[model samples]
Target: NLSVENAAEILILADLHSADQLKTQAVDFINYHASDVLETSGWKSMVVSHPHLVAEAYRSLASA
Candidate 1:
């Protein structure tokens, strides 16, 4: 259930506490909608709480 509508929090949580499959999907979701994900309320908090994941998101965006 990784809908784009709920992707920000899900991706952040997945990066922090889920498996490779979930993480991969999350990253892909972010990549697919980088601007939307960046605008999410959770984005700033996730950046602070999980910088690594944030970095991964940036990397995904750049690589795309």
Candidate 2:
């Protein structure tokens, strides 16, 4: 069983302006390499959280 105290692993992907930018980059890379890696695998994007923001959020939650 998982422990309630265990912290979760968070991944934050940043600097992506828009979904079009992401798609364009992915397609260019995939087409240039002509590899199955991009086709076989999928993409998942997330936000970039500042350390202070995360800390503040956690502190706020704890105080609540």
Candidate 3:
């Protein structure tokens, strides 16, 4: 049940714990659906708490 609302959490956890497969999937999802994922309720905190990940995501988007 990885809806847009919870995808940020899943992405963060995956990145934090070195879950490569899940992190890749989440990063791809976020890069493809940036607006939808960014609008999620938890996105602000996720970005604030994990700035490195936020940067990584933007890097992914830029290179796409």
Candidate 4:
């Protein structure tokens, strides 16, 4: 979809539901557009709900 608006939610949903492909796409979106993704409300909410996921995202970026 190349959609930025729901990327964070999609990421969270993917993780919770074990949707590997969707998670990758969402994470890739977040990785490529981290600046914007970081400032999103969805990101903020996801932070509290899934801090571990955020850490994994950090690791992903760190590895790159």
Candidate 5:
């Protein structure tokens, strides 16, 4: 129910809607495990709506 792809989707939804609580958890999930999160539709799709978050996600990807 809460895998990295799911978290990416949650992160994008939260980014689009401004759900800090939900967004934060999603971000932490991605930050910790996103090295293998892969190129999810959620991650790729987030660029148009929330490029900043996508950039941050890429940062995590790069970190590990």
Candidate 6:
């Protein structure tokens, strides 16, 4: 259902994984490694799809 809807999802290996970990690992693997930087592709708007992920991204930049 969800896989069909999004066409992109991760397969988690373990239980009790935090939402933050899911977001980070997905970004690291897909965004930073697998795919081109979304911003470079003019697809930055897509980055707002996830609220927790967006909030964590802001938190990271604010800390830096």
Per-model TM values vs. the true structure:
0.75, 0.28, 0.88, 0.89, 0.66, 0.30
- Model 3 stretches astray by more than 4 angstroms: none
lDDT of 3 at 25: 86
lDDT of 3 by residue, 24-62 (tens): 788888877778988987677898888888888888888
lDDT of 5 by residue, 1-64 (tens): 5696677788878878988888777877877776656567766667676789978766755776
Best by TM-score: 4
RMSD of each: 1.8, 16.7, 1.1, 1.1, 3.1, 7.5
Candidate models: Cα lDDT each: 0.77, 0.30, 0.83, 0.86, 0.74, 0.38
Error of 3 at 40 (Å): 1.1
- TM match of model 5 to true structure: 0.66
Candidate order by decreasing lDDT: 4, 3, 1, 5, 6, 2
Off by over 4 Å in 1: none
Better of 4 and 5 by TM-score: 4
List of clashing residue pairs for candidate 2:
none
Query: For candidate 3, which ten residues in a row score worst on lDDT?
Result: 1-10
- In every candidate, how many clashes are there? 0, 0, 0, 0, 0, 0
Q: In candidate 2, what residue range of length 10 has the lowest lDDT sum?
A: 3-12
lDDT by residue (tens digit), candidate 6, 1-64: 2122121244122112555665555444443332443333222443444444445445654564
lDDT of 4 at 22: 86
Worst 10 residues of 4 by lDDT: 1-10
Considering every candidate listed, which one attains the maximal lDDT? 4
**CA error at residue 43 for candidate 1, angstroms:** 1.4
Q: Candidate 2: deviation at residue 4, Å?
A: 36
Among residues 3 or more apart in sequence or in different chains, the pairs in candidate 3 whose N, CA or C atoms overlap within 3 Å are: none
